Coordinates of C-alpha atoms in Angstrom, one line a residue:
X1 CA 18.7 30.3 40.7
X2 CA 21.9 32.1 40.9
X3 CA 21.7 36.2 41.7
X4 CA 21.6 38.1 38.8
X5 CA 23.2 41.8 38.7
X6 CA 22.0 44.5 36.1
X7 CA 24.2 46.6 34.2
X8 CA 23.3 49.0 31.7
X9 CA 25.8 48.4 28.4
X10 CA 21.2 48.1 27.2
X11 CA 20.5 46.7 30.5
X12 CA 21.7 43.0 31.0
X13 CA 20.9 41.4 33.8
X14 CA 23.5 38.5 34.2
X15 CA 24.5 36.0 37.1
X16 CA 26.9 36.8 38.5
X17 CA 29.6 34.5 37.7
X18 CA 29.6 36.4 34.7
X19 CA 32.2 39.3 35.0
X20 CA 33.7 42.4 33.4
X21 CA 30.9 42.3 30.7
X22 CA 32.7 44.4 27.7
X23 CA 30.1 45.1 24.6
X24 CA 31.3 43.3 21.8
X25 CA 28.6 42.6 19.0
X26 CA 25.0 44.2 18.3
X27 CA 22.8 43.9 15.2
X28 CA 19.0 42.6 15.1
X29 CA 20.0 39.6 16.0
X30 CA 20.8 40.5 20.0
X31 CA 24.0 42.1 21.8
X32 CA 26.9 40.3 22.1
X33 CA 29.3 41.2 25.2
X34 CA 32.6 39.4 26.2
X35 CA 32.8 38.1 29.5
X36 CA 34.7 36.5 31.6
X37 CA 33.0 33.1 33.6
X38 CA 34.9 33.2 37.0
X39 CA 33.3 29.4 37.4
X40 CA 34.6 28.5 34.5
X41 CA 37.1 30.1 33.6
X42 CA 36.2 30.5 30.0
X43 CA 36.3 33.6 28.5
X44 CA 32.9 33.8 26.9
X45 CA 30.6 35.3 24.7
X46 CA 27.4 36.6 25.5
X47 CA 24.1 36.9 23.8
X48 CA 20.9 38.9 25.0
X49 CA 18.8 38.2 22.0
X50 CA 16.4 41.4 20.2
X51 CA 13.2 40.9 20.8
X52 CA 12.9 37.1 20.9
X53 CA 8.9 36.7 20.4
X54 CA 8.5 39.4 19.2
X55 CA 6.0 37.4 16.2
X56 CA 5.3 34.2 15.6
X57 CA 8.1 34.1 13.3
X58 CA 10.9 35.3 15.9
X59 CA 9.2 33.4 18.5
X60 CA 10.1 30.1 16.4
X61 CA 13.4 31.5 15.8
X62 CA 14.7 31.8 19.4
X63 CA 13.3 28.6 19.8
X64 CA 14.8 27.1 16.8
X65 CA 18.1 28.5 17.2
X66 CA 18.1 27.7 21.4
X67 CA 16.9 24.0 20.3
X68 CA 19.8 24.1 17.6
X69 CA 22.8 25.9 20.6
X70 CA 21.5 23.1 22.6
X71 CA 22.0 19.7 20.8
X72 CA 25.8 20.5 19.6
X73 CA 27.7 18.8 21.5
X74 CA 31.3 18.1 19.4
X75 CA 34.3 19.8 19.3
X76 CA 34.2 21.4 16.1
X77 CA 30.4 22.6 16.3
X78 CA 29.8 25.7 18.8
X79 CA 27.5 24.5 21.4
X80 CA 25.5 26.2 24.5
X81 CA 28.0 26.7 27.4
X82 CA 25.0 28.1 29.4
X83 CA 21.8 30.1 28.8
X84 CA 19.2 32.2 31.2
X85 CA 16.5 34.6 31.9
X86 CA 16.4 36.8 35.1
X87 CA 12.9 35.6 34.9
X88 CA 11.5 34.2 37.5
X89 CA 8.4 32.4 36.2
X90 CA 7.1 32.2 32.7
X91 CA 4.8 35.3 33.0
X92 CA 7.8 37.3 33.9
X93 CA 9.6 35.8 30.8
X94 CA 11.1 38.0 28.3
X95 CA 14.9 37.8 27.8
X96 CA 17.0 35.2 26.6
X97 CA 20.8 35.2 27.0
X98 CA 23.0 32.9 25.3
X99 CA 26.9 32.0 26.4
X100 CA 29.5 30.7 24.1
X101 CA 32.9 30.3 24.0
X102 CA 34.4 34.1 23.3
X103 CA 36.0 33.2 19.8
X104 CA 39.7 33.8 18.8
X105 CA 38.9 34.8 14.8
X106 CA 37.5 33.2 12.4
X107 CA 38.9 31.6 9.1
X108 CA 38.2 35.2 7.0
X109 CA 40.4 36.6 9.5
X110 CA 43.0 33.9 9.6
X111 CA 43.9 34.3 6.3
X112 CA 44.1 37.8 6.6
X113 CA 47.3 37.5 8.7
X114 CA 48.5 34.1 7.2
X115 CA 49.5 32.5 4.2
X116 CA 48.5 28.9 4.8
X117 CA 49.7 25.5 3.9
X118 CA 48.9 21.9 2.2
X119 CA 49.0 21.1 6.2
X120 CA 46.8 23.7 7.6
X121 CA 44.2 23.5 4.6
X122 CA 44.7 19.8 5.4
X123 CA 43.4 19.7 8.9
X124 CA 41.4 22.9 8.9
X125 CA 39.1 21.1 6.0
X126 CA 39.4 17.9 8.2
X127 CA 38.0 19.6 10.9
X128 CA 34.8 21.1 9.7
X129 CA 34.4 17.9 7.6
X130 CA 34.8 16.1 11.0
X131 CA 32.1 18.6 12.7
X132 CA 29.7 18.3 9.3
X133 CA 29.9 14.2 9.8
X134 CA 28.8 15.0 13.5
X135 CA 25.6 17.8 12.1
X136 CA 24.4 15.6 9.7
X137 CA 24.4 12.3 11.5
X138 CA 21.4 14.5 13.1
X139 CA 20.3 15.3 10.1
X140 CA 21.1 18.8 10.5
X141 CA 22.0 21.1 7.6
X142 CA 24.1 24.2 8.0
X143 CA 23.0 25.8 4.8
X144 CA 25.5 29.0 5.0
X145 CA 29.0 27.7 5.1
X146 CA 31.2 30.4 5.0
X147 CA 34.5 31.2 6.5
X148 CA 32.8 33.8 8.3
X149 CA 31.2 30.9 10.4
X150 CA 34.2 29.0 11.0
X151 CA 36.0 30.1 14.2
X152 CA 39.8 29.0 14.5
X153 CA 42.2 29.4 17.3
X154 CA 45.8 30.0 17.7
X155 CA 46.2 26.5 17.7
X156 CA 44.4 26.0 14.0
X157 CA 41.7 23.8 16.1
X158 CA 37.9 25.1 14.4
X159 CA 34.5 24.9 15.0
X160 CA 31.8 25.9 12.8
X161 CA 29.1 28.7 14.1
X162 CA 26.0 30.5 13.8
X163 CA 23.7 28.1 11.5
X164 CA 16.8 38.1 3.0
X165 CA 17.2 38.3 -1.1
X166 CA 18.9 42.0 -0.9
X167 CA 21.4 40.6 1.2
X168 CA 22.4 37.7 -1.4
X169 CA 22.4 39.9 -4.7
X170 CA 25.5 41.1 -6.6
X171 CA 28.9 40.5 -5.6
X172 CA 28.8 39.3 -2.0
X173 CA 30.1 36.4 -0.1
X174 CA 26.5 35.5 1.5
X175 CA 26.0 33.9 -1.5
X176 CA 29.3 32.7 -3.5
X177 CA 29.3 29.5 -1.0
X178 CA 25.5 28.2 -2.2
X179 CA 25.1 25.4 -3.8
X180 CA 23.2 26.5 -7.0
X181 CA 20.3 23.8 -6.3
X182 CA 19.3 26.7 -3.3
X183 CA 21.0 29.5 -5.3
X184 CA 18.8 29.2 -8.4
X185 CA 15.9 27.2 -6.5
X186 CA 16.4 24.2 -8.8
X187 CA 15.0 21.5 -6.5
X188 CA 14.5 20.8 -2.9
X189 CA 17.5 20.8 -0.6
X190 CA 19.4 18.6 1.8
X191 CA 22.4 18.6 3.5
X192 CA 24.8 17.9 0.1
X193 CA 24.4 21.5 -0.2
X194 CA 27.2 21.6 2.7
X195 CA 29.9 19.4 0.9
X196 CA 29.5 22.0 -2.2
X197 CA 30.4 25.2 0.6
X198 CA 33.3 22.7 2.0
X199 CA 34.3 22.4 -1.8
X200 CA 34.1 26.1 -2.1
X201 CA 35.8 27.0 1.1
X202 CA 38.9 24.4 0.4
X203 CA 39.5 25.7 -2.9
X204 CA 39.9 29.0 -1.5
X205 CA 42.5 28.1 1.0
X206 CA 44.2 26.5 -1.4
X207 CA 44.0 29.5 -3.9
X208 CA 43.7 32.4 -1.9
X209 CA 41.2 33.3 -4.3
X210 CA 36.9 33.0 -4.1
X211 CA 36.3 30.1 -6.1
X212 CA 33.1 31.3 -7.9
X213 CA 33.3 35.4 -6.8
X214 CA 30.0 36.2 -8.7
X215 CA 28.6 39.3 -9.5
X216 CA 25.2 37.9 -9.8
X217 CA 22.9 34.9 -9.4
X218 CA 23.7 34.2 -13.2
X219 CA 27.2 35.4 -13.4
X220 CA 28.1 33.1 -10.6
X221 CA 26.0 30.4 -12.4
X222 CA 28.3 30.8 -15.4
X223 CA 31.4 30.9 -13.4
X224 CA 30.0 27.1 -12.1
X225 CA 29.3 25.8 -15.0
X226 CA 32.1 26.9 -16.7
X227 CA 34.4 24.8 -14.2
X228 CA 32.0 21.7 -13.5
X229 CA 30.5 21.5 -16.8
X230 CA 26.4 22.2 -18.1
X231 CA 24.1 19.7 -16.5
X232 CA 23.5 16.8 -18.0
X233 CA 19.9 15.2 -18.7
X234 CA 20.0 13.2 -15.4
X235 CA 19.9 16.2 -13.4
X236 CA 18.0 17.8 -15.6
X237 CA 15.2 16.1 -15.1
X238 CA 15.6 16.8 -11.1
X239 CA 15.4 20.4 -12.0
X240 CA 11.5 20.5 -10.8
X241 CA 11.4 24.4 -12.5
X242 CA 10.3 24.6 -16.4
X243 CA 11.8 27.7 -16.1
X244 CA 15.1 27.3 -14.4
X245 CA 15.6 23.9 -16.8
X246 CA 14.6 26.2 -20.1
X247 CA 17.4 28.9 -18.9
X248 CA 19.9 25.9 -18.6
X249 CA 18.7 24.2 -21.9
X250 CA 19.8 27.9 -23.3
X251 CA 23.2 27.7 -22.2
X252 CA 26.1 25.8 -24.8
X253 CA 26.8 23.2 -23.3
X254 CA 30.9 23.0 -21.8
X255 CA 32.8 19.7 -20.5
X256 CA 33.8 19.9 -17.2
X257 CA 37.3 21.2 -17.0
X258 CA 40.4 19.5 -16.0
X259 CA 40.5 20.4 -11.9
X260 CA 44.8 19.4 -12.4
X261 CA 45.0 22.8 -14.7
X262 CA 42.9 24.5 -12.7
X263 CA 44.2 24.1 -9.2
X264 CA 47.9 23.8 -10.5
X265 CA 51.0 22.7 -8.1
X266 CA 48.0 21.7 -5.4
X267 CA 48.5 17.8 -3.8
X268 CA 46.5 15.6 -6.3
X269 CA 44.8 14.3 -3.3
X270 CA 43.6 17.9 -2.6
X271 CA 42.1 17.9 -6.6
X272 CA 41.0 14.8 -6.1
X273 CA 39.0 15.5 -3.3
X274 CA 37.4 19.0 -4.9
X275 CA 36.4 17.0 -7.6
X276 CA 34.6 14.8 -5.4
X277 CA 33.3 17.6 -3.8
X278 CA 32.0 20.3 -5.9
X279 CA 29.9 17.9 -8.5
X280 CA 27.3 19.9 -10.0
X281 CA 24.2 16.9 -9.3
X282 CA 23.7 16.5 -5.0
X283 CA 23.1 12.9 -5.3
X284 CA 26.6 12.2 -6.2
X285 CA 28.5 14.2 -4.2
X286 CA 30.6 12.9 -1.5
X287 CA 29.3 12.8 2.3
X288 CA 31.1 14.5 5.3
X289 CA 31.8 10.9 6.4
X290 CA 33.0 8.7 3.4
X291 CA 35.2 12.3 2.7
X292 CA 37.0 11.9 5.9
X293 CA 37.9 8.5 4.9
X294 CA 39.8 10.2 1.9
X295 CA 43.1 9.6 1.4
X296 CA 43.6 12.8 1.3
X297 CA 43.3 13.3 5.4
X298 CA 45.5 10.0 6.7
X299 CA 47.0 12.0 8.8
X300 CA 44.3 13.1 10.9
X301 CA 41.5 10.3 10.3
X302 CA 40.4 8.3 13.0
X303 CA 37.0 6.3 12.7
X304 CA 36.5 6.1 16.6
X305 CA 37.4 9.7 16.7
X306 CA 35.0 11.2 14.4
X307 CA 31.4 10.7 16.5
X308 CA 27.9 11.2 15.2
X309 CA 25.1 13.3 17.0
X310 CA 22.4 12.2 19.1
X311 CA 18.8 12.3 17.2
X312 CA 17.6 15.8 16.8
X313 CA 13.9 16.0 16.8
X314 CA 12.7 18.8 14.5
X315 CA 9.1 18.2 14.1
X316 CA 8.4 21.4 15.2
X317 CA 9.4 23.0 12.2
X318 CA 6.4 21.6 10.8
X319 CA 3.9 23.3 13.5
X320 CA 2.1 26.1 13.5
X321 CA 1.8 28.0 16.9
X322 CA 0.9 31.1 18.4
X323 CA 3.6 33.1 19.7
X324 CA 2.8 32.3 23.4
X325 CA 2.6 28.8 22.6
X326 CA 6.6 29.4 20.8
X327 CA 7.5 31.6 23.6
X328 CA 6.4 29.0 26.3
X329 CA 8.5 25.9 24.6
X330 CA 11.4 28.4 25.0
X331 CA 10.9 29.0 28.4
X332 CA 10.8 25.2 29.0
X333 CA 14.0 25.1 27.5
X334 CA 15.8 27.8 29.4
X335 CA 14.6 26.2 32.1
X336 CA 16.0 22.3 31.6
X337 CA 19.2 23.4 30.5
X338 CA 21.4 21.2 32.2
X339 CA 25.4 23.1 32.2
X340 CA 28.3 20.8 30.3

């Protein structure tokens, strides 16, 4: 067990290795400080989660996003660089602390300060493709792709981070990434949904512009269909929802548009690979790993450089348990974490 000091920025109790805490982040999610890891070196971030079990619900949670931190092992997916508990046995349990690498900016901010290029939008989309390849190989599915959870360093190298209805109405970015299959709740999920953020997020840095910046659930639905066309009867009958198919069935029906006039001067290889991305039906989509084989990346691909994941067991997402029962699977995870 390392010794642990106490500071009061809240109080964290931290080993310490960790120095010159400096509060950084905060929200009901847990505080974030910067620190610096003397053993390591790294300049890191650190997490003291809110009220982990605080219900059966957040008790799941901080188990589901500690089972998550700890599988990732890839260099464009954050991973767990360490996690602890001043605890000393499970009845003392309480407090979780996560460390991560302290990150440079993220993608958002990039742009902010940078025009980019064909190159940069080249291996920037390369890269997250690269670290989508690795999350789905485990059958992982990121479900909020957004440039806010794509970190990038001074050296363009990325990894992608962090994994209510309010928060996705009207014109706000939490939602003009979704794939409308989850937007609209036309079907079940799976990870295709991520290709259609990639799609979103690509387009972007090559326009400087949100590719579908609606106002609303049905505005951006519009501002979809209006580029990739009115479903078709084949997906159609996928919609599960009466409903949702009826409101499509009401809309006139538009031919997907020409992607050449709509992303005009970008490298055809760069249309060409939107297209392949951002198709309207999931099933015929392109995957993480047949679109790093495109054409479009030969500069960066490598097939023995561009791993999968080890299995990630997530049968717990299917159990029900009380709190205490959540609570004590965490602590038996704090507890085996073996450092990189």
């Amino acid at each position: 067990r390392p010794t642990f000091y106490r500071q009061e920025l809240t109080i964290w109790e931290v080993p310490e290795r960790y120095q010159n805490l400096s509060p950084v982040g905060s929200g009901a999610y847990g505080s974030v400080c910067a620190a610096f890891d003397t053993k390591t070196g790294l300049r890191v971030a650190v997490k003291k989660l809110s009220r982990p079990f605080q219900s059966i619900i957040h008790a799941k949670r901080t188990y589901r996003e500690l089972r998550l931190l700890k599988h990732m092992k890839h260099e464009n997916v954050i991973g767990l660089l360490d996690v602890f508990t001043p605890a000393r046995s499970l009845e003392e349990f309480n407090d979780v602390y996560l460390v991560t690498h302290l990150m440079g900016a993220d993608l958002n901010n990039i742009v902010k300060c940078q025009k980019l290029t064909d190159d940069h939008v080249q291996f920037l989309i390369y890269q997250i493709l690269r670290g989508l390849k690795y999350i789905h190989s485990a059958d992982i599915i990121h479900r909020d792709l957004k440039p806010s959870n794509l970190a990038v360093n001074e050296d363009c190298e990325l990894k992608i981070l962090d994994f209510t209805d309010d928060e996705m109405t009207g014109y706000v970015a939490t939602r003009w990434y979704r794939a409308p299959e989850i937007m609209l709740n036309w079907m079940h999920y799976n990870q295709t949904v991520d290709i259609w953020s990639v799609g979103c997020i690509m387009a972007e840095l090559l326009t400087g512009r949100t590719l579908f910046p609606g106002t609303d659930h049905i505005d951006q639905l519009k501002l979809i269909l209006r580029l990739v066309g009115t479903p078709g009867a084949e997906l159609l009958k996928k919609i599960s929802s009466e409903s949702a198919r009826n409101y499509i069935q009401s809309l006139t029906q538009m031919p997907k548009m020409n992607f050449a006039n709509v992303f005009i001067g970008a490298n055809p290889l760069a249309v060409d690979l939107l297209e392949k991305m951002l198709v309207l039906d999931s099933d015929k989509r392109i995957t993480a790993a047949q679109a790093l084989a495109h054409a479009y990346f030969a500069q960066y691909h490598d097939p023995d450089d561009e791993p999968v994941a080890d299995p990630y067991d997530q049968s717990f997402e299917s159990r029900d348990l009380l709190i205490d029962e959540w609570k004590s699977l965490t602590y038996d995870e704090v507890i085996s974490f073996v450092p990189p």
